[PDB]
Amino acid sequence: GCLAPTNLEYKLQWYQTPEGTGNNGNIIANPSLSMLRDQLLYKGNQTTYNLVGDIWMFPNQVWDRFPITRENPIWCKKPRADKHTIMDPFDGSIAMDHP
Amino acid sequence: GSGVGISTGGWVGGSHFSDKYVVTKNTRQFITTIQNGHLYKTEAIETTNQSGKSQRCVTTPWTYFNFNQYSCHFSPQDWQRLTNEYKRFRPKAMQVKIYNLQIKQILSNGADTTYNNDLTAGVHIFCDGEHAYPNASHPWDEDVMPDLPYKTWKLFQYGYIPIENELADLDGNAAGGNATEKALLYQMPFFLLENSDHQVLRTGESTEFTFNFDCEWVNNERAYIPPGLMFNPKVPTRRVQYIRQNGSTAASTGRIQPYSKPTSWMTGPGLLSAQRVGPQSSDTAPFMVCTNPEGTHINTGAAGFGSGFDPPSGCLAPTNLEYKLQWYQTPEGTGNNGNIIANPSLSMLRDQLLYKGNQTTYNLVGDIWMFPNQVWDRFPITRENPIWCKKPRADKHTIMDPFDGSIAMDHPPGTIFIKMAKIPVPTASNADSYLNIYCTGQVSCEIVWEVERYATKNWRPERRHTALGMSLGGESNYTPTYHVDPTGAYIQPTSYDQCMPVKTNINKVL
Amino acid sequence: GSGVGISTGGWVGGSHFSDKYVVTKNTRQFITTIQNGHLYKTEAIETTNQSGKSQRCVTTPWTYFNFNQYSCHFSPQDWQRLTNEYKRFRPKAMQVKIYNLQIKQILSNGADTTYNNDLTAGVHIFCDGEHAYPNASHPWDEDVMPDLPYKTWKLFQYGYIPIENELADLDGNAAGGNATEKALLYQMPFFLLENSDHQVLRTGESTEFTFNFDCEWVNNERAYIPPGLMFNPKVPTRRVQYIRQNGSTAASTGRIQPYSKPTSWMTGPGLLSAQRVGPQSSDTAPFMVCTNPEGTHINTGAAGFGSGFDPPSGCLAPTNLEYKLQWYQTPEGTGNNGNIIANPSLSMLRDQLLYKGNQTTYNLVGDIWMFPNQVWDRFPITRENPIWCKKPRADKHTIMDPFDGSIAMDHPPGTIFIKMAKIPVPTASNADSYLNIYCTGQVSCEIVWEVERYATKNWRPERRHTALGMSLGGESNYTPTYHVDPTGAYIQPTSYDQCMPVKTNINKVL
Amino acid sequence: EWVNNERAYIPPGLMFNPKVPTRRVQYIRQNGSTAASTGRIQPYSKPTS
Amino acid sequence: ERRHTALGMSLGGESNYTPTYHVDPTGAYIQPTSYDQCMPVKTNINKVL
Amino acid sequence: NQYSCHFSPQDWQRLTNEYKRFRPKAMQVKIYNLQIKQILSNGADTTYN
Amino acid sequence: WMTGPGLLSAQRVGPQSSDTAPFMVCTNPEGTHINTGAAGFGSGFDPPS
Amino acid sequence: LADLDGNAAGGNATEKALLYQMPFFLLENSDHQVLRTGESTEFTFNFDC
Amino acid sequence: GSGVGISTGGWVGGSHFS
């Protein structure tokens, strides 16, 4: 979420009304042109730079949020558990206690 | 009375110390210029190399007051008394007044360059305060209010970056030539400060603004022990151990020693793995954070075009000079004479480390992210650090916790913009003409700091900022750090013991 | 307080959007000059060719503020938000303020050309508002308030045409020499703005005027079907047909098909038959409307001396480039680089046609006049079109309906005239002398627009003004349409998709 | 919580004014060869928190 | 600022025409093609950050 | 739970163009006008009464 | 939803009798000590993962 | 008006611009009454004609 | 009234923007 997908495997594909059945029906969920989204982090060694694949929560990260389209779910169920985290679903849906 | 010949306000200065506040008043003398042609343009900034890079930087006729540093509000005396006598402080409110304006006309024949005031000329003065326009101030910028009074403070032009220049490019057509390159240009925000309603002032007028601050405290205290030492080493603990077989060396099960008990607490986040890159002249490095809507660009070349994250490994042992702050100092040098290294503060909630044991001995973990139970405290702001930083508008974020030490506020005190009203001149067609004038006046920034006093049960004497850590000298010599040379030079503080960082003093029991 | 050294008013700007209004505030910086000798004269305008033509044009020392365009009141942002979010709008009221005047004296030795203010000098400021004097403003004229703030706006001289020059002539005596030629000259209205009572302002003063508007709405909606498609094609209609024998091909009587039912509604008026004429340089063409009290002149030569009717075939298919609007744009070019074609808006109450069937197939009717049941809608004003036009005082007229798209009002907001008081100088006899000064100040035009929001039962998404129809670029490139060049140039909007015409968006069900 | 329809148009790292100088210096490791030097951050490309 | 135009809609409905949000000659509803149809939030307006 | 069920394409367009942020306050659902039919199948008729 | 945080990579070290291990968290104001020897003098984080 | 029909024929661009905005009206968008046998309705009207 | 032969509620639809 909030990283450059760098491949099709990291993306949303709706599909659409149930047929297809693919790949005719699916849609790729292209970037929204923010600029709080997508991004990247490069780690410089002595010479040039290399993309850091996995970057976890770190202070000062500010990523905005997935740009929900008209077909996205409105909310999602937020599990009952002691602790959790920012939450921030990557599907774009709102996580509510008691939807 | 009012009008020309009547001073609109008086000078004001000095600080006052009370149990619950320090109200620090400062008045400075400022100057403006025509600041381009009164017209905005835009500028690709000339880059030294030019290997490649640029920035779009629409520039404005406006110029702005930047109040953000501690050194401008506090004298070295007052900073000393603040960091020694109080555990924590935050600003409640700030009040600024522009008054006693003199608008002079610049008359240059090539020799005289006379200056005679023009009444009826005026200056535009606009305090954003909604943060509707792109923020002018940025932490660590020069353009801050100068340290000393009696030094004229020259205002700096206001400009801002529209869409990042590396993204589009184009440049290439049919090269390409890409379509998403242009989609970023077609929407490029373009901000005029004339869109907003704002005041025009002739000589007789003054203005005032104020502000209010919700900001978090900045804490002057030191830990004296890591959080892992809370335990009483006299009493036994039950936690046992085990171990893997490893070896040979058949594994055994045994109790934790009374000393060296377990710790639930963890090392504050920071990233040590990265390294600076190459020529300088840009960016430089490490941990460049950039956006790459796909593909842009990608390409990719050259690698790493984007904003760098300068002081990673906040609350970690720096382990090298590259991870540190270096101020410099007043703009020359130019290095390395002027820079200062920002040495450790001796907490003990700062610095730290994390070692990862394999079967045999231990190895430093370079990059450690946010993890529960991490408690790192915060950067020990000195007198030259910025007070606040602008906190971006975005949905989610994180602890924040800037590593520069500055407070991250939603709505920092709004930047105050000033330009001088264009005075047009009759001319043949085109010929932007106008008239060469400059404004001069007095800004008085009165900020109230909510402050609170320490009380300790420690028997032993605590550390304080002595002023015997000051150093000569002033070219030739003598002239201690906060003082003035035989020439008017102010002999900026050498090293890190001068400028008196917070968190070095008092104590916290944790 | 009051007097020199006290700004009389502040800058003001920006627009505000509410359900029922958009109040758009704009402040500009203006400049005046001595504008002839303070004396009127009259001028036969030098004509390029000079095949023949002229105009009488009594010129005045006065100069005037022309507020009539949409682009001056609305930013591209605000025009976009207006045309996207609202079906119709009209101005309720306008308020103008002249304030912060600087009257400078021009001192020229041939080199210095110094400028030093003269207090006690003054400017005359007169708002007609009764339309007792000939109107200064005319649609599509430059002299309108400039698009951008921060651009100085140079005022343009006020002049008006007394009796048409072609009518008299004379010129010929005994040639002749005609008697009715002179009868038109003997009564030639001659207007002095000093006849009227008006204000004189020194630096300390400001003025304000306001206004009120009775004007009709301008509607942003699109038809999506001609009025002839109202019918339900599923249900049968009774209207029968017949036909003539023609042929051979013996005529038969039969029912109208369910599709293609009759229509009571008719094509809006317009005239396609005329053509442009020749050299340019005057008039040019088509449909010159002129007066010819008999015989004058008649003669006749050369043919067609009179005012041309530029955009005939309002609400008709243009069928050629000659029938269209071409803005240009900021004054250079000079063509054809600057001009823009004013493409169709895709209503469907616009454009259209009428075909006249003879026995075999159909033929376009070139000129179609007012006829009952014609319903044509109206020209889709863009951001650069004039807001209003002056509606002549006359007994009768017609629908009106200007083809330029501008609103025709009885009593448009009165033109505001400004000259600088003649400052005389001692001299030997004759020697009109006086003194060279110029005025500079700030006009703030605050106009309130009555506005109303659309609601549609359409399921499907409607068209909007994207801003992705904007185009590069700024010499070299990038710098999208509403934005500023690396040089201060503003990169005027290319084509017709930029500048965002009304009636392209939303829908009307008819 | 709200769902926000807005776009950033710049990364958060571009907040700075590129016209004004910044003090933050740099250093670098020796690397190389290529003896390391200490120098100021350029006015463009300022640090980002 | 950018807006959702509805000129980014696409044909078509088998055979053709029948733009995205609309109905085929058969009762089919011709679901929106790609991502420009269905109009995601955060593409429009701006935030100054 | 979807946005497409509550908003028409027209209304989604007008929502994402004209407003910076939105959240639902309240939802109200009504089940009414119930018809309970019996399915009678002999293998051919499959009548419904 | 995602897995709660924890660290499985580390291993206990050697003789016991101190500290023992894994994930020793310690402070090292530079250089102290650094040295470095022996490695890992500081408080251990006992139940990671 | 559109036609298209022809592609590359053409194939014209303004042909499609008329299709992309094609109003499509559902009477279910509106709020309206449902009646069983027991109910009746009444409306009236008024005429300025 | 109530019972079979009386519609319990009417259709409703459309959105409103404020």
UniProtKB/Swiss-Prot annotation, chain D:
Domain observations: The N-terminus of Isoform Minor capsid protein VP1, VP1u, contains a phospholipase A2-like region. VP1u may play a role in the disruption of host tight junctions in the airway tract. A nuclear localization signal is present in the C-terminus and can be recognized by cellular nuclear import molecules. After assembly, it is hidden because it is on the inner capsid surface.
Segment forming the signal sequence: none
Protein name according to UniProt: Minor capsid protein VP1
Superkingdom to which the source organism belongs: Viruses
Similarity annotation: Belongs to the parvoviridae capsid protein family.
Chain's role: Capsid proteins self-assembles to form an icosahedral capsid with a T=1 symmetry, about 26 nm in diameter, and consisting of 60 copies of three size variants of the capsid proteins, VP1, and VP3, which differ by the presence of an N-terminal extension in the minor protein VP1. The capsid has a channel at the 5-fold axis and there are densities extending the 5-fold axis into the interior of the capsid. The capsid encapsulates the genomic ssDNA.
Span of the entire protein shown here: 377 to 425 of 671
Subunit structure: Heteromultimer of isoform Minor capsid protein VP1, isoform Minor capsid protein VP2 and isoform Major capsid protein VP3. Isoform Major capsid protein VP3 is a homomultimer. Isoform Major capsid protein VP3 is 10 fold more abundant than the minor capsid proteins VP1 and VP2.
Swiss-Prot record, chain G:
Transmembrane domains' residue ranges: none
Superkingdom of source: Viruses
Subunit structure and binding partners: Heteromultimer of isoform Minor capsid protein VP1, isoform Minor capsid protein VP2 and isoform Major capsid protein VP3. Isoform Major capsid protein VP3 is a homomultimer. Isoform Major capsid protein VP3 is 10 fold more abundant than the minor capsid proteins VP1 and VP2.
Functional note: Capsid proteins self-assembles to form an icosahedral capsid with a T=1 symmetry, about 26 nm in diameter, and consisting of 60 copies of three size variants of the capsid proteins, VP1, and VP3, which differ by the presence of an N-terminal extension in the minor protein VP1. The capsid has a channel at the 5-fold axis and there are densities extending the 5-fold axis into the interior of the capsid. The capsid encapsulates the genomic ssDNA.
Swiss-Prot/TrEMBL domain comment: The N-terminus of Isoform Minor capsid protein VP1, VP1u, contains a phospholipase A2-like region. VP1u may play a role in the disruption of host tight junctions in the airway tract.
Family affiliation: Belongs to the parvoviridae capsid protein family.
Protein name: Minor capsid protein VP1
Organism: Primate bocaparvovirus 1 (strain Human bocavirus 1 type 1) (HBoV1)
Lineage, top ranks: Viruses, Monodnaviria, Shotokuvirae, Cossaviricota, Quintoviricetes
Name of the encoding gene: VP1
Swiss-Prot record, chain H:
Transmembrane portions of the chain: none
Highest taxon in the source lineage: Viruses
Similarity remark: Belongs to the parvoviridae capsid protein family.
Domain notes: The N-terminus of Isoform Minor capsid protein VP1, VP1u, contains a phospholipase A2-like region. VP1u may play a role in the disruption of host tight junctions in the airway tract. A nuclear localization signal is present in the C-terminus and can be recognized by cellular nuclear import molecules. After assembly, it is hidden because it is on the inner capsid surface.
Role according to the record: Capsid proteins self-assembles to form an icosahedral capsid with a T=1 symmetry, about 26 nm in diameter, and consisting of 60 copies of three size variants of the capsid proteins, VP1, and VP3, which differ by the presence of an N-terminal extension in the minor protein VP1. The capsid has a channel at the 5-fold axis and there are densities extending the 5-fold axis into the interior of the capsid. The capsid encapsulates the genomic ssDNA.
Quaternary organization: Heteromultimer of isoform Minor capsid protein VP1, isoform Minor capsid protein VP2 and isoform Major capsid protein VP3. Isoform Major capsid protein VP3 is a homomultimer. Isoform Major capsid protein VP3 is 10 fold more abundant than the minor capsid proteins VP1 and VP2.
Protein name, as recorded: Minor capsid protein VP1
Residues of the whole record sequence present: 328 to 376 of 671
